[PDB]
Amino acid sequence: KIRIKLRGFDHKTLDASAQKIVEAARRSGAQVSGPIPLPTRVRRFTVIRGPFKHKDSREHFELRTHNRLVDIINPNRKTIEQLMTLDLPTGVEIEIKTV
Amino acid sequence: GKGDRRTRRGKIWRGTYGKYRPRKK
Amino acid sequence: ARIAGVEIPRNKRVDVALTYIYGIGKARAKEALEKTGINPATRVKDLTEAEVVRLREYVENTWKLEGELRAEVAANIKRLMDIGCYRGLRHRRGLPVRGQRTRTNARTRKGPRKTVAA
Amino acid sequence: ARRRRAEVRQLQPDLVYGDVLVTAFINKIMRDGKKNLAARIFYDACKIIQEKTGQEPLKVFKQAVENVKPRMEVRSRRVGGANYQVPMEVSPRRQQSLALRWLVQAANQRPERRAAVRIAHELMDAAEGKGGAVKKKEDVERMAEANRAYAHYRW
Amino acid sequence: SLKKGVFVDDHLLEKVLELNAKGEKRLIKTWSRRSTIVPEMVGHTIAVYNGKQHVPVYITENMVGHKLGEFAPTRTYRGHG
Amino acid sequence: EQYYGTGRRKEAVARVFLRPGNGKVTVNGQDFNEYFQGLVRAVAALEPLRAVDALGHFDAYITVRGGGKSGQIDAIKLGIARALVQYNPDYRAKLKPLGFLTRDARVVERKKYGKHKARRAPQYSKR
Amino acid sequence: ARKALIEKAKRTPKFKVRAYTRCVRCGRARSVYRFFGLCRICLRELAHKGQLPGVRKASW
RNA sequence: CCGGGCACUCUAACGGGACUGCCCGCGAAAGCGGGAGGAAGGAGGGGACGACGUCUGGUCAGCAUGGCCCUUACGGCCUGGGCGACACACGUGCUACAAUGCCCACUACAAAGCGAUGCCACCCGGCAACGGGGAGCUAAUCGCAAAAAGGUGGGCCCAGUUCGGAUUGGGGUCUGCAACCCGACCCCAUGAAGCCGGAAUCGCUAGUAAUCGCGGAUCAGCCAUGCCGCGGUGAAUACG
Ligand SMILES: [Mg+2]
Ligand SMILES: [Mg+2]
Ligand SMILES: [Mg+2]
Ligand SMILES: [Mg+2]
Ligand SMILES: [Mg+2]
Ligand SMILES: [Mg+2]
Ligand SMILES: [Mg+2]
Ligand SMILES: [Mg+2]
Ligand SMILES: [Mg+2]
Ligand SMILES: [Mg+2]
Ligand SMILES: [Mg+2]
Ligand SMILES: [Mg+2]
Ligand SMILES: [Mg+2]
Ligand SMILES: [Mg+2]
Ligand SMILES: [Mg+2]
Ligand SMILES: [Mg+2]
Ligand SMILES: [Mg+2]
Ligand SMILES: [Mg+2]
Ligand SMILES: [Mg+2]
Ligand SMILES: [Mg+2]
Ligand SMILES: [Mg+2]
Ligand SMILES: [Mg+2]
Ligand SMILES: [Mg+2]
Ligand SMILES: [Zn+2]
């Protein structure tokens, strides 16, 4: 019943992150249903490419919020302590709730 | 057509709602 | 037959022919049709000389129409002019009264273009 | 078409009469991309070739098409001296399209208020020969008649 | 428009309400063209400002709902040639 | 107990279920000719049926979503195309020459900065 | 923009309608992305050096 | 909707997959044609990507920056105005001139993005804009949301018109310290020019051009018909 919301701007790190938590749960305790990608929410910035006036010829960029979900059913207190101090993320974000 | 705000099509075009384009669903 | 002023509409429809009266149309029309409980889909060609006076008496009396109406709008503007107000100047000079832009086409209120040299 | 021989757009056959020359006709009735409206017109026309005439409307169509197919035309060509007007035969592909075009254009010119009634008569008249769309077909062949002098400058 | 509203700047609204019960009425320059006019403004002479200078305007009963900057125009014209 | 195929044209995706029956067709909980009523090209959605000679041999339960009605129709077409190639896949023999076995890779081309509709370019000036 | 101008932007009070966003790199008033607080030239500039997180030039 | 499963659709990461690698023909090879493959070919379709350089190209008003120049002002604050001026002239556009069309009613099928200083279902008030109330959502989980053309049904009957809605009159809604100059929107009235446009001239080769709606950035609000994008339906035609 305890669920983790994963977000990050790079999926090369975001994937390799949720994948550690999978075995920081599976190996260390009760069942956790496999990583599900939530669709990616895209902020996009399209912009005039030069300083002055050339309205045609824009460059555009985007910023990717990728979402990845993993659910946990049954608590073990070796899971939790692994899920407390054993943290090895960087530019990833993590969230947990009991609902 | 798309310019008469007194019609469905007009309203839709301008993106508004009213007596001629009630908000209902 | 004739409604306020002279203004005889005919054939067509009743709800439609009513627009041809000045001060009236669409809404004000389908209004007076169920307010006299008259069928709008019917043609002004045929209808009871009763529901004709039903229909005339209502309209002519409900709201003000072509004669006294135009006379009022005339007087509104006269008032707006000569009071000296800015709405009134753009009536005086025949230029567009509500915002817009006169560097280019005001043509509806400006007349046809009258060209000159460069 | 500088490099290519520019291959031909190949059309999916009709649903009802099961025919290419129809869909190809249908397209030409289509204003602003509405295929629905187009066949719902053309079809409503064949309805009119029915209660009115005792023929079999597709069969008329193939005929009115053949009646409106221009046999020779006049294309411009640039030579030493002036730019000319030279008679040559129309390609099979071309008469096809030319015929298809004229039918619709003439059709839409007839005064009848509904659309399908215009294609009705025009397809009728064209088949029966008196069509305004056939007038055009002729008027072209005549042009290539009158210019038979320049007939030796063809490619 | 406004309605729960009818905004008038209070700079002058003082000197107006004041020139009613003082007993005296005379010439008042303001910058507030955003405000509305009347009822106690009537009979009073107010100088509005067009961006250039203060313009005298006589005030009467049919000037009612109108902003003050209506009777003091912002531009100069007199045609072209 | 039943036969299935997948097809999609242009953002519309089709789930096709085939069990033999009278020839009834259902489309997203609807009779075919109610949902597609009033659309001319509707009947070409199931082409390979008559092209395989199976007439009233199969019924159809079909779910479909995305795109639009008339490109959904070429989507369903690929369902019946890959379903009828499931039951006795000798039906590839004449299906593919009819073309019924390919996906239309043709989709809306995007838009380009400086253009207008993605090819259509703004009017030229010179003066 | 000028200095007194790049300042007055930040002095936000008096009638909150007047606060206008401005580039925190330039001073540039025009075309300032809410998100970055950058103007359009700087967003292109920083994004190119990588100094905009998870911001990469798109294509499709 | 519940149980249940995720099988499918999908969501999103990782691969696979076509390389003229196979057959016949040509050919000295490279390559070209042609066939069978296959979801796909002959660089599959579309991006992103722009050689040495040219235009003493553009930009000292994004920024940086040498030089020159002002210092109770060429700096600095404000109130109000102007950038919105109108005899005219040009570019880019939007809406049309109608019956493959207009209107009203019912009925369907998208994609991409946005939103808990916001998006606001739903109930009431109001013709309506909108206003009261007020639940859910840090959001594949609630909301923007109705997609529209299409479909069906009925109406208009060729008329400067149920076409077209420019101008103007009165009445209001909202934002905002404030809408005279200069806001957008709703309603009643008003209904102009316009019956496919002189010489001339633009775009587009396919899921393109037409045509139909939808989202976002900026943003209080908006003069957006603009711009960057999304999908729906979907032609014509290339002899040369
Ligand atoms: Mg109308
Ligand atoms: Mg102006
Ligand atoms: Mg997809
Ligand atoms: Mg441009
Ligand atoms: Mg498109
Ligand atoms: Mg240019
Ligand atoms: Mg602002
Ligand atoms: Mg700004
Ligand atoms: Mg092959
Ligand atoms: Mg090659
Ligand atoms: Mg390259
Ligand atoms: Mg500088
Ligand atoms: Mg200064
Ligand atoms: Mg100032
Ligand atoms: Mg300007
Ligand atoms: Mg425009
Ligand atoms: Mg006229
Ligand atoms: Mg103003
Ligand atoms: Mg006409
Ligand atoms: Mg023109
Ligand atoms: Mg090309
Ligand atoms: Mg906005
Ligand atoms: Mg828009
Ligand atoms: Zn900047």
Side-chain angles (χ1 to χ4, degrees):
Chain A
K1 303 170 180 70
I2 246 185
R3 157 247 273 190
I4 64 195
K5 246 184 222 159
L6 289 207
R7 275 169 304 246
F9 283 154
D10 177 14
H11 90 263
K12 301 241 209 283
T13 74
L14 209 251
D15 280 322
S17 265
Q19 274 284 341
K20 185 243 185 181
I21 293 179
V22 149
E23 301 127 59
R26 277 191 184 173
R27 160 188 52 86
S28 77
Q31 272 186 3
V32 290
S33 69
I36 171 173
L38 290 189
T40 296
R41 290 278 275 260
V42 166
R43 205 143 228 115
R44 188 174 275 90
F45 311 106
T46 282
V47 65
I48 278 164
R49 177 184 288 254
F52 203 13
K53 43 195 33 157
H54 297 123
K55 175 80 154 199
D56 312 338
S57 183
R58 312 205 224 247
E59 178 170 19
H60 26 207
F61 320 87
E62 64 199 352
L63 174 67
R64 322 214 119 216
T65 282
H66 322 77
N67 312 291
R68 225 140 293 251
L69 195 82
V70 160
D71 275 339
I72 316 199
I73 335 154
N74 354 72
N76 307 14
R77 304 308 168 214
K78 173 44 73 176
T79 71
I80 297 206
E81 180 201 350
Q82 195 143 190
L83 305 197
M84 201 174 60
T85 59
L86 205 7
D87 292 26
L88 279 172
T90 150
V92 187
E93 206 206 43
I94 62 278
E95 315 259 284
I96 274 99
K97 44 185 58 172
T98 359
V99 77
Chain B
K2 310 174 185 87
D4 199 13
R5 335 148 86 85
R6 292 219 195 183
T7 54
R8 180 67 96 163
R9 315 307 320 285
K11 234 87 179 150
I12 317 169
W13 175 96
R14 189 150 280 103
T16 42
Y17 289 104
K19 192 177 185 166
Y20 308 98
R21 199 216 178 191
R23 188 150 19 178
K24 173 65 195 286
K25 167 87 171 173
Chain C
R2 12 187 80 205
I3 322 294
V6 157
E7 306 228 66
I8 292 209
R10 173 158 264 85
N11 199 318
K12 275 290 113 266
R13 244 169 142 85
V14 168
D15 66 334
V16 169
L18 245 344
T19 329
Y20 284 79
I21 322 195
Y22 177 80
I24 298 157
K26 290 303 156 108
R28 283 205 170 181
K30 291 85 170 182
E31 202 262 28
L33 259 287
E34 61 210 43
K35 293 286 281 165
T36 59
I38 292 184
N39 183 0
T42 48
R43 350 278 294 177
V44 23
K45 216 125 207 69
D46 59 309
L47 65 190
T48 318
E49 294 265 27
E51 54 178 337
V52 159
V53 192
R54 275 229 305 288
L55 217 272
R56 168 170 58 267
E57 290 258 326
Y58 182 86
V59 180
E60 196 158 343
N61 292 296
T62 313
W63 23 57
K64 86 151 58 181
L65 288 194
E66 126 272 18
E68 186 183 20
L69 210 206
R70 256 188 293 253
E72 185 174 78
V73 195
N76 282 358
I77 309 174
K78 178 192 196 61
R79 187 201 74 103
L80 261 162
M81 300 169 47
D82 73 36
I83 186 46
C85 101
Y86 174 80
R87 284 267 271 0
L89 297 175
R90 317 282 292 176
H91 290 290
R92 285 181 155 278
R93 275 4 183 186
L95 284 180
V97 92
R98 35 184 93 163
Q100 302 132 311
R101 93 186 274 249
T102 32
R103 186 191 201 161
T104 101
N105 35 231
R107 256 63 239 8
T108 294
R109 203 160 158 86
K110 241 183 156 173
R113 358 179 87 83
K114 343 129 195 163
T115 306
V116 223
Chain D
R2 279 227 199 249
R3 193 150 20 223
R4 212 171 49 135
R5 251 227 51 147
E7 49 76 24
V8 205
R9 180 109 333 183
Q10 172 52 262
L11 268 72
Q12 218 216 351
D14 169 34
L15 290 199
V16 166
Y17 293 121
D19 186 44
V20 276
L21 170 85
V22 195
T23 29
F25 182 89
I26 298 263
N27 304 0
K28 293 303 237 178
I29 320 147
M30 190 182 348
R31 195 186 167 184
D32 299 339
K34 319 192 181 174
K35 248 266 206 322
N36 206 5
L37 232 305
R40 136 188 296 260
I41 275 180
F42 162 83
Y43 276 130
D44 265 83
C46 312
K47 174 240 288 186
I48 309 298
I49 319 264
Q50 280 293 34
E51 194 191 330
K52 241 121 172 187
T53 127
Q55 311 267 352
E56 308 92 319
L58 177 161
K59 187 198 160 66
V60 159
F61 180 95
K62 146 67 181 53
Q63 202 44 21
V65 159
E66 197 75 346
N67 289 16
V68 170
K69 280 198 175 199
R71 307 183 63 71
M72 288 175 280
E73 74 182 336
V74 284
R75 322 191 87 139
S76 318
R77 142 81 174 167
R78 227 276 145 214
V79 263
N83 207 325
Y84 265 142
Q85 276 251 287
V86 175
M88 315 188 56
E89 343 107 307
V90 221
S91 91
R93 165 77 171 103
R94 271 205 57 108
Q95 321 167 16
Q96 173 86 252
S97 319
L98 290 181
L100 283 185
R101 205 174 300 137
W102 289 333
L103 247 310
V104 191
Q105 301 204 259
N108 244 336
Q109 268 211 271
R110 329 176 101 271
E112 9 268 341
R113 298 188 167 185
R114 284 176 103 215
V117 62
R118 296 198 287 264
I119 307 212
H121 305 163
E122 188 59 31
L123 227 131
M124 274 161 36
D125 283 13
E128 292 172 341
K130 64 210 238 68
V134 200
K135 306 264 248 63
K136 219 301 189 286
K137 171 258 200 183
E138 285 165 349
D139 188 275
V140 160
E141 289 168 322
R142 231 184 293 120
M143 298 273 199
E145 234 336 297
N147 287 49
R148 250 197 93 150
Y150 299 133
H152 62 286
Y153 266 154
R154 92 291 147 259
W155 38 15
Chain E
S1 25
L2 338 157
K3 236 188 83 203
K4 143 247 292 70
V6 169
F7 314 72
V8 41
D9 273 30
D10 294 320
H11 326 331
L12 82 170
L13 183 40
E14 184 192 2
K15 196 61 177 167
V16 182
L17 261 177
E18 153 150 15
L19 265 20
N20 297 132
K22 186 190 188 55
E24 285 91 44
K25 58 192 175 195
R26 11 72 53 99
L27 25 280
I28 165 188
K29 4 237 290 173
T30 163
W31 284 252
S32 192
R33 43 192 306 118
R34 18 131 56 145
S35 55
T36 316
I37 184 183
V38 320
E40 21 241 312
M41 301 232 216
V42 302
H44 275 354
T45 283
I46 292 185
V48 198
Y49 185 84
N50 49 11
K52 189 177 180 47
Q53 96 200 223
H54 292 308
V55 32
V57 23
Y58 25 67
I59 304 201
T60 161
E61 52 193 54
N62 38 3
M63 294 184 189
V64 242
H66 292 273
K67 316 290 166 157
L68 269 225
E70 299 206 54
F71 302 87
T74 20
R75 40 65 188 178
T76 311
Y77 199 55
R78 299 172 302 238
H80 280 286
Chain F
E1 186 226 341
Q2 81 178 354
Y3 299 79
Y4 168 87
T6 232
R8 27 223 278 251
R9 225 276 214 99
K10 197 203 310 179
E11 291 292 348
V13 211
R15 239 193 321 226
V16 178
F17 304 143
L18 291 188
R19 31 258 197 170
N22 75 285
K24 170 168 189 176
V25 191
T26 312
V27 202
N28 281 72
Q30 210 124 46
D31 173 26
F32 194 102
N33 300 9
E34 161 93 15
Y35 177 78
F36 282 136
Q37 169 259 100
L39 263 160
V40 200
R41 46 178 341 256
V43 323
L46 27 285
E47 273 306 293
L49 285 200
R50 226 201 303 201
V52 118
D53 203 273
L55 190 174
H57 285 55
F58 306 93
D59 279 332
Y61 186 75
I62 305 193
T63 83
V64 79
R65 42 176 50 209
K69 264 167 155 66
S70 311
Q72 270 182 200
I73 278 172
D74 282 272
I76 286 170
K77 202 177 189 172
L78 216 228
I80 331 295
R82 291 168 139 185
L84 294 198
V85 84
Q86 252 177 5
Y87 162 39
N88 65 263
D90 55 281
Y91 268 165
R92 160 85 141 253
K94 10 81 56 198
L95 230 59
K96 180 53 204 306
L98 263 284
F100 300 145
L101 282 184
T102 302
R103 188 194 158 158
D104 242 328
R106 297 142 42 185
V107 222
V108 160
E109 192 174 340
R110 12 165 319 201
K111 204 297 180 79
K112 279 91 144 65
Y113 48 82
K115 303 325 197 63
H116 232 160
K117 298 223 343 277
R119 248 144 201 204
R120 212 289 193 199
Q123 257 184 177
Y124 196 1
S125 64
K126 214 186 265 184
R127 256 163 232 124
Chain G
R2 288 176 288 197
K3 277 294 248 41
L5 275 181
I6 54 96
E7 226 60 62
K8 159 153 52 194
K10 320 163 103 161
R11 78 114 112 104
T12 292
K14 205 193 182 163
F15 304 119
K16 45 100 178 179
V17 247
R18 303 185 180 187
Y20 54 90
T21 73
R22 199 95 99 145
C23 185
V24 306
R25 205 163 163 254
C26 286
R28 171 149 176 88
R30 299 201 119 96
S31 288
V32 257
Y33 282 65
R34 293 187 74 56
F35 194 93
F36 296 90
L38 292 183
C39 87
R40 65 154 236 262
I41 304 140
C42 297
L43 136 47
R44 186 189 156 72
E45 282 181 1
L46 293 186
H48 273 333
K49 340 185 47 192
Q51 304 186 333
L52 293 197
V55 178
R56 166 185 42 248
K57 46 187 289 153
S59 48
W60 72 100

